Structures are given as structure tokens and as C-alpha cells.
Write a protein that binds this ligand. Structure first.
Ligand SMILES: C=C1/C(=C\C=C2/CCC[C@]3(C)[C@@H]([C@H](C)c4ccc(C(C)(C)O)o4)CC[C@@H]23)C[C@@H](O)C[C@@H]1O
Length: 254
């Protein structure tokens, strides 16, 4: 069972992606106070009527997601080969993967300590009850939490985490892509980097079938993407919803 060494080029790709992530993911969440403030209405009963009437957490979470899409755009532009694509394909890939990369990158704030995304003091701790206060339902939130825990338990090296985000973005099978072959060539270069990295740098037993497990998470993300889109559609029917979102969020999901 051969373990070819990482090529000079593969090493450079990993370094570039690590740098890209460090430049676009602030692990202190220090910008979050700039978003519209979180508001948490009394909703212990999980009332859909109340949740939709108030959408109390939506301005804050929409601002968080919008900010994150901006960061993902920056990250993607640094992926080796991404700028070789036409502008049209770049935008198709970004719009189709945005929610999935947000879900992946959020794993860094997610904690199994209490099953929350913890981004600072209580104000910026986001729980399932906060997501329902933004107008989403359990059919999305429950599998989202299951996804976060499963990803956590893979114990990815940062190298593997950034590669997975890059592979997710540069996917040839997104609707509307023009040069699928070029996209696939870029993705293959990243996939080969990841497979090679796992085999020579990830110790047992966590390395066992790890690449397959990571590829399965990409399939899981497609499912969550579809469910999020259905739910966003419903949310959009609420009068005055657009003011609680952002122009970027409206474009990506509308
Ligand atoms: C973003 C990041 C973070 C959390 C992501 C969350 C927590 C709150 C609920 C969110 C935002 C989920 C929620 C279902 C969601 C995603 C998009 C939307 C809207 C409200 C736009 O429909 O709601 C998806 C990702 C979840 C914090 C930090 O890790 C940065 C990361 O980019």
C-alpha cells in the first residue's frame, strides 16, 4: 500500500490554502459586534407563528451569513486554479457552494461542549433555538447538528479542513457550469493533494477510510443545501423579510 510523498506543488497548494483560510477566517469573531444585534424573543414553545411574526434572530444571522459569503469569495479566489476559470463559472461555483462552505467553515466555532456555535460571550453563542428564531425548522436544523458532530468526530487536520472547503467549491457537477472539464481538472489536483496528505501525514486509526468519510460529508452537504433552499423560499414569503436580509444574501439564495 504505497505512500507517495507530497510533491513540491502539493506542498505549495496546502500552504496557499492554509494562508487563504487564516486571512479569511477570524477565530476571535471580533467583527461580529458590527452586525445588527441578536434579539431573542420568548419562544420556549417553538411557535412557528411567533417565529415568523418576529424573525428576531434573522437580521443578526443574515449579517453573519452575508459577511461569511464575502469571506468565502475571498478564500475561493486564492484556491490554486480558481482564477483560471471564466468569470461566469467562478460565479456559478460561488453561488452554488456558498451555503455548503458556510456550513463546513462553521465547524470551527461549533462545540460539542454544549452543541452550539460558540463565537464569544452569550450574545454570540448560537443554539438550535436561535436558528428557529431566524425562521428555519427542524427538518434542516437537526440534520445540520448531526452533520456538525460527524465532522467534528473526524478530527480533521487544518490541512484537510481547508482542502475539503476548496474541493467543495470547485465542483464540476453544479448546474450551469460551462467548462466542466477544467473545473474537474482543478478539483482533481486538490483531491489528489488531499488523498496523498492523508496517507503520509495522518496517523492511524483516525486516518482509516478518512478520504471516503470526507467525500461522504460532501454528499451530506448537497442534501442540506437542498433543504436550506426550500426553507429559504418559505422564509422569503414573509412580508418585510427582505429588509431583514442583505443584498448579497438575496442574490445568492433568491
Ligand atoms: C457562519 C459561520 C458561523 C456560524 C454558522 C451558523 C450558526 C447559526 C445558524 C447558521 C447560520 C445556519 C443557518 C441554517 C443559516 C444559514 C443561512 C441561513 C439564512 C438565515 C440566510 O437562511 O440560515 C447555517 C450555518 C449556521 C460562525 C463562524 O463559525 C463563522 C461561520 O462563517
Amino acid at each position: 500500500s504505497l505512500r507517495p510523498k507530497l510533491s513540491e506543488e502539493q506542498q505549495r497548494i496546502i500552504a496557499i490554502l492554509l494562508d487563504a483560510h487564516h486571512k479569511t477566517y477570524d477565530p476571535t469573531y471580533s467583527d461580529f459586534c458590527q452586525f445588527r444585534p441578536p434579539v431573542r424573543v420568548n419562544d420556549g414553545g417553538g411557535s412557528v407563528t411567533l417565529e415568523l411574526s418576529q424573525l428576531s434572530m434573522l437580521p443578526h444571522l443574515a449579517d453573519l451569513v452575508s459577511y461569511s459569503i464575502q469571506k468565502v469569495i475571498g478564500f475561493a479566489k486564492m484556491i490554486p486554479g480558481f482564477r483560471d476559470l471564466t468569470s461566469e463559472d467562478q460565479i456559478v461555483l460561488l453561488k452554488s457552494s456558498a451555503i455548503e462552505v458556510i456550513m463546513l467553515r462553521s465547524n470551527e466555532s461549533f462545540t460539542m461542549d454544549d452543541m452550539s456555535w460558540t463565537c464569544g460571550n452569550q450574545d454570540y453563542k448560537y443554539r438550535v433555538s436561535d436558528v428557529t428564531k431566524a425562521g428555519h425548522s427542524l427538518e434542516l436544523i437537526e440534520p445540520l447538528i448531526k452533520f456538525q458532530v460527524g465532522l467534528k468526530k473526524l478530527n480533521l487536520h487544518e490541512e484537510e479542513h481547508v482542502l475539503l472547503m476548496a474541493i467543495c467549491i470547485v465542483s464540476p457537477d453544479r448546474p450551469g457550469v460551462q467548462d466542466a472539464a477544467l473545473i474537474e481538472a482543478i478539483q482533481d489536483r486538490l483531491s489528489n493533494t488531499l488523498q496523498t496528505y492523508i496517507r503520509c501525514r495522518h496517523p492511524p486509526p483516525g486516518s482509516h477510510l478518512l478520504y471516503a468519510k470526507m467525500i461522504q460529508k460532501l454528499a451530506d452537504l448537497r442534501s442540506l443545501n437542498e433543504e436550506h433552499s426550500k426553507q429559504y423560499r418559505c422564509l422569503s414569503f414573509q412580508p418585510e423579510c427582505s429588509m431583514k436580509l442583505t443584498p448579497l444574501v438575496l442574490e445568492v439564495f433568491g
